[model samples]
Target: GIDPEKAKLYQAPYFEKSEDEMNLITKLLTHNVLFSFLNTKDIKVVAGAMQRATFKHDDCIMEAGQTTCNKLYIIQSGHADIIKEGQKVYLKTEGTAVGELELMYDTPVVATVKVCTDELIAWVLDRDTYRNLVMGTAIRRRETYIQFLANVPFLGGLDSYEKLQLADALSSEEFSPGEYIIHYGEEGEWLYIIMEGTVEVIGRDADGEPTKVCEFTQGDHIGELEFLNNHRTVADVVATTHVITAKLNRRHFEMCLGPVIDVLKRCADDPKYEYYQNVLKTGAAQPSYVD
Candidate 1:
């Protein structure tokens, strides 16, 4: 909630986005990791507060090594040249964000952005609006998810941006104690990772009786075997305590990372997936990776 006191500090004027502007910003937000962490309500609020902006060719937006940055721009149909020291280093096109991260921190700007095309269009917001919304790209949000994904065994070899995109697709949920998070024989929808608390893996023991095979805690994930294979779950997974989970459904996983079955399976072919390979063979009712 915007407090009355904070409301008074809103020096930036509110800007409304038209239907056309809304659609453009919506596409960018969905595709870019820049503001992907914002919830639906917050996305609307931030979009509504963004003011439309245009720049002529060769106009400088921000200078390299500048100490302060007040505004962040999301290119709508603009082409930008990002240069460092002297030569051209990178080119930013439509749907890119400029100065968004540097605005949150007082670090020196690394590159100078100048309009390259005859006309550049953008959806922009100032630091005042950014602060109010607590919106930012890497450090402010998605950092933890990035770190978590980096540590996830099967998600290895993914570049930073791939992990960032994967992070954007993850959604969190709460599970009460004793809840059956995954039922044996059911097709997997979401592969669950424990954000907090513990979960028990229940399946048949060597004697053919159902028993608790193992326990998983924070950072541990389940349903990979089923998800990767597109097969039924071989065992029941239960939340042993009040559990907080960050889960990604197969569709979102494949969509962001692209047919990850190859990448995920490819891991077992390397030294990196040794731990996963070791874990795959244990426990009764554990489906064989081959079968």
Candidate 2:
């Protein structure tokens, strides 16, 4: 099944790199979004695990909507174009890491990145190694996640320690247009925070026909009502565009902040509850809350 000639162009023997290759990789890692979070020692450890590869002009390095490419590519030289919906989005050059969100949050590739130069060279890190080595010790990312949680009224009660615990439980996901993020009447599990794009909440009318209740955009939270009340989903949530979300499931939510659920419930009545309140009242089925 191997095309020896073609493979030679794209594949460098896995985990085999020369001394010069390691130096280049270490240099690139210094500026990468994901790897830059690592310290010097971890960076060196990751450098040893990187693989080198090359691509011809116009070759697709990563495809949109596929979750199977479990490797992150950091461009060492040349450039690539990120294409989404057949349009060029962003151009990535040296030091840019492709598949960052994909590896970090287990989401599908957000866009297709194709080589734009005659030959594009990159260092690759597999999912297993990155997740175990880099992510396990990514302090910067942990702080980022904590900051995001602080913005939510319900999660506002969480202290720094608890938020750190919550960070480990969070993961990112992407959804395309018309994708049902939450189905009405399904058991609620994860609480989602929108990092990008929008979603429409569809609730049933009296006769059971679905109607668009509200649209949520960046920074909005979903499934909070369901998660807090121990109820099935009140309505269907569907992506209206390319959506990216950070999700934390009930299991982890409870593990880190269950004892503070009461505090969250109390915060729901606070005047600052406007954000969560808008979705709760405007939606077709209001989330049942105990006073």
Candidate 3:
């Protein structure tokens, strides 16, 4: 729906992203709910394909009455005002996503975005990039995750929509033989759902050396025991085969499912509920979330 007369267009040459640029862009996109839905591969795809646009004060970043849509913006620096009916209603700051729905449909952009600073910079993502990635990956990927979450115990009460949101929050990783998914006595912020292949929970023997306690295949998860208790992980979780997992951070999980304490309490009251048996059988001392 890109119409030349409806808006000003900006396009520039592209170069490979520097390490520093990748860090900033990844941090910005992952932390924002709008862009957070993208999986790891697609995020990097847009991060590299996107361009930078520099704007001056009082410029119309987007016009209220425009009919056709072609681009979305991520405010990388400075600020802008969402001007509706000649008055400022919302101030957009750094890392704010703008005009994301442009790719969703042909509805005219509803508000005027006026640049509020002398140097307002944004990452310009053309509609083509989103059209290519969002449709091809997110819809297909999220639907797959909904099925995966249904098998997870702590996630039992979530509505389908909530599962979809949690689905979007998941980012996947693949591990080779003997790679740590969650190291023993370390971070407790993520829930790892096995999407493919297998993993094993490892704990210490009486000599404080490593021993394999149990194994998990597809539809199993790790970190729930500590995630519910807000304690650090109790065992070393690692891949026994080439494994793929869709992981949800506890923060994003809470955003989808609400308070961890309440979730666990509710799940506990259910007569049929059973925790993933891997952690309980490990017999390692639980680590405190001190760091």
Candidate 4:
């Protein structure tokens, strides 16, 4: 339960997001595990009503031992430390999320956070935003939630339903030959589902030369490891031809489907696994990862 004092006393930096900030907020929300449970319509409702804020380096975003109300935040720039006791233990970088549970349930904050750099930008959504636009028992929202939970890779396995569920979340796009799909050291958070043509994975060598590590084609997936583990890209993916591919953003995978590694591993020992790998090796076959 929230105290009346804290509930009424909103934190400082109450401001509306600018156009650029709103664009980034839209992207951030779309990439989070919790928000992917909402459809495009629901997203618009919540996004239109969100509030934003900015913080300087070393600023205390949240303080330990303080009563907190329902407040969710999306980081836009710089980083934040989730401090407990007297030490900082966790850091959230750009496009990262925090305070989801605050709005999910009436939970108070248990940690303190402070900025570590010179400038930090954030979007703060309050309880009213959830109540007015998000908390209803909308059927589409419920269906999205069910689909999301069913995507739990370990428990549900990769059935036809799950496979199609993943496929539906993807968007297909094309790239020309010699074009880079993802560059080295960029903040990448989506898995590429090859639908046409081929992609070559290149990692940096000791002399800074980009060496080929793997080749993928239609129906194969790359970048799954990074998306599942919330890690950075280790290689650059370049198109070998005019490539058409589908991409599943990390947030969608994490929120609706959960991690795919367990499901990927379950298929590894099956005799049909080699055939699946061969499909991935192809340039034009749409070999799906299905149970």
For each candidate, what is the lDDT?
0.70, 0.73, 0.70, 0.62
Off by over 4 Å in 3: 1-14, 135-186, 190-291
List pairs with backbone clashes in candidate 2.
none
Error of 1 at 268 (Å): 12
Model 3 global lDDT (CA atoms, 0 to 1)? 0.70
For model 1, the superposed segments whose C-alpha errors exceed 4 Å read 1-12, 30-41, 54-61, 67-69, 78-94, 113-120, 136-147, 154-244, 247-291
What is candidate 4's TM-score against the reference? 0.48
TM-score of each: 0.54, 0.44, 0.48, 0.48
Compared with the true structure, what per-residue lDDT tens digits does model 1 show for residues 1-291? 345476556655557678887776776655555565667766776777787789999998788877766788888887999888888866778777788647655567878998899999988777767766645434534665777778766567566756766776676788999999998767676678787899888765457567666788887778776667555676788998999987776545444555356755664676634434444666323432311
Name the candidate that leads on lDDT: 2
Q: Judged by lDDT against the true structure, how good is candidate 2?
A: 0.73
lDDT of candidate 4 at residue 263, scale 0 to 100: 72
Total clashing residue pairs per candidate? Answer: 0, 0, 0, 0
Among all windows of 10 consecutive residues in model 1, the one with the lowest summed lDDT is: 282-291
Q: For model 1, state the Cα shift of residue 22 in Å.
A: 2.7
Q: Could you tell me which 10 consecutive residues in candidate 2 have the lowest summed lDDT?
A: 4-13
